[PDB]
Design a protein around this ligand. Structure first.
Ligand code: MG
Length: 202
């Protein structure tokens, strides 16, 4: 499939149009006629592009952009607006929507817009996937390796790590080697970067 689209709109006419033009274009589709049906589903939705009514009851463009950011979703979001509501869509753009379409619109404008939005959002998809794995790599260290790693990324030398965590200075190099291989880090430098993505530096 060419991408999956989650459509949110209380107008059955719109849901039916979009389901048609998107299927006839090769995308998968899930329709939500109800705001909390979409929210209830969001934490186990796989990656896809959201196409939402800018004035969905309960979940307008601003409201949706805030809940998507709060749930830290990398799903790109397109906003469907009527001409009178474009000021509202603009506020959704300032909160990170990818684009908006004012109604009526041509189908190929929307499909083009969807392809582009999916292409632009896949780096942050892959990024959050990598942050997931990094967290798993951290979780897998032994408590002594977690100690050495905390030290290294805090900037401590071999001896300061050794007297802070009370470890023979002759074995730091060894827990460091184990940390590096389990973190798949090629240098202190990269180990600290991995730590930052993991949120162990704040
Ligand atoms: Mg509506």
């Amino acid at each position: 499939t060419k991408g999956h689209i989650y459509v949110i709109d209380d107008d059955a006419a719109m849901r039916d149009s979009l389901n048609f033009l998107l299927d006839s274009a090769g995308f998968g589709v899930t329709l939500f006629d109800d705001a909390q049906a979409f929210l209830d589903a969001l934490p186990g939705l796989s990656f896809g592009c959201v196409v939402s009514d800018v004035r969905m009851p309960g979940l307008d463009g601003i409201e949706l952009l805030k809940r998507m950011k709060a749930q830290q979703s990398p799903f790109p979001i397109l906003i469907m607006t009527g001409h009178g509501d474009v000021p509202l869509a603009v506020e959704a753009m300032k909160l990170g929507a990818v684009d908006f379409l004012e109604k009526p619109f041509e189908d190929d404008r929307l499909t083009a817009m969807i392809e582009s939005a999916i292409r632009q959002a896949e780096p942050a998809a892959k990024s959050e996937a990598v942050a997931q794995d990094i967290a798993a790599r951290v979780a897998s260290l032994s408590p002594r390796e977690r100690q050495v790693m905390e030290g290294l990324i805090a900037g401590l030398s071999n001896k300061l790590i050794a007297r802070e965590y009370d470890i023979s200075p002759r074995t730091i190099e060894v827990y460091r080697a184990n940390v590096m291989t389990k973190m798949q880090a090629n240098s202190l430098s990269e180990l600290v970067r991995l730590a930052m993505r993991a949120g162990m530096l704040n």
